Amino acid sequence: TPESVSELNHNHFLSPELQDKLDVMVSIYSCARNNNELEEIFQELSAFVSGLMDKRNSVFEVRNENTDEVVGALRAGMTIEDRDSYIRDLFFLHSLKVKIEESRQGKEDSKCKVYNLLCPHHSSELYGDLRAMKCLVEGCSDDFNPFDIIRVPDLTYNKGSLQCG
Amino acid sequence: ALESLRGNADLAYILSMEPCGHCLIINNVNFCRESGLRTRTGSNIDCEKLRRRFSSLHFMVEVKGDLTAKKMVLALLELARQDHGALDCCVVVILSHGCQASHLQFPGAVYGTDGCPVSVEKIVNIFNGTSCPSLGGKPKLFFIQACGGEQKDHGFEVASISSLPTPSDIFVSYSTFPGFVSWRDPKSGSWYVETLDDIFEQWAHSEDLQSLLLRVANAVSVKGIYKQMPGCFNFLRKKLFFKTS
DSSP: OOSOOSSOOGGGSOOHHHHHHHHHHHHHHHHOOSTTTTHHHHHHHHHHHHHHHHHHHHHEEEESTTSSOOEEEEOTTOOHHHHHHHHHHHHHHHHHHHHHHHHOSSSTTOOOHHHHHSSOOTTSHHHHHHHHHHHHHTTOOOSSOOSSOOOSSOTTTTOSSSEEO | OTTTTTSOTTTBOOOOSSSOEEEEEEEOOOOOTTTOOOOOTTHHHHHHHHHHHHHHTTEEEEEEESOOHHHHHHHHHHHHTSOOSSOOOEEEEEESOEEOOOOSSSOOEEEOTTSOEEEHHHHHHTTSTTTOGGGTTSOEEEEEESOOOSBOBOOOOOOOOOOOOTTOSEEEEESSOTTBOOEEETTTEEHHHHHHHHHHHHHTTTSOHHHHHHHHHHHHHTOSSSBOOOEEEEEOSSBOOOOOO
């Protein structure tokens, strides 16, 4: 319960700063045409994602890797506020990805560099979290769907017994 | 019947010379922080299993670890540049992460250490008759241990003048069906390679390459809660019986 959340609270929604940063990127992305115009937007997300990955490694800890008995946990001297501030930054990525998928309804195969940041590899840490976020926001997802509960920062994803590769 | 069909010009490849040929093994284990790809632990066990295995089959085996995407291409190009006149065969094993791709000929891609892909399409076309003329009418094998796509499979319930074309004699053995994940135990190693080496021990002397990978496909298909279906894109003209002393 301290390490992770099952369902999203009022603390997990976007702040006015993140909401303003989201709306500016969405407006700039759709109205832009050439790949040269998106270089300002690409450098934002790649800076944001690399900052988001550092925020995970400072906040969270994975004990007992490559086993059945894998457990997630918060780092020493790290509060519940530090978790929810990461999940806010994680929500930003999901909600930005949703609106980019709306802007790419026509040509759904452009090979965009900005979109490929929001589609990380299926072994990665961020894929585990974004797939976890998608289940809670968009309702279940129904990929396999057992009795087990979904963790909104999936710390144990691809780190035990069976792994991708 | 068994021994007679081996030594046949029409139905089987001739592997007379010692060694058979070169055997490149790209083994990408440790990937960069920027890509976010997890460290493929237990692939060094799979690497050394195959390294001993192809050495037992009379191949000049050469392992190259943690290659970037550009070094993978330079490593494959330099192999194709060799004089395979005296050589009868050629093998290229690749152990890495993978992904789904907008393919034209062959599905799948394989990542480098830098974390950008090299398509299987591109890897195979390096060894075609135009680019590598020394392997003309010679089997060119490829064993690609990597993920096909992001999708995890649960499966279903079951009750218990001489004419020879440029892309001839290609054989790309896939570890998982295109668009599905390849599974791996950190201690044991990959399901594909663990099952490949075990079957190559027991049935290399009697059975051909296609018959061997049928056992690998069967043995891997029964495994685990999550499922995996290995196969191969066969473009061979004859049966490939591996040589053992």
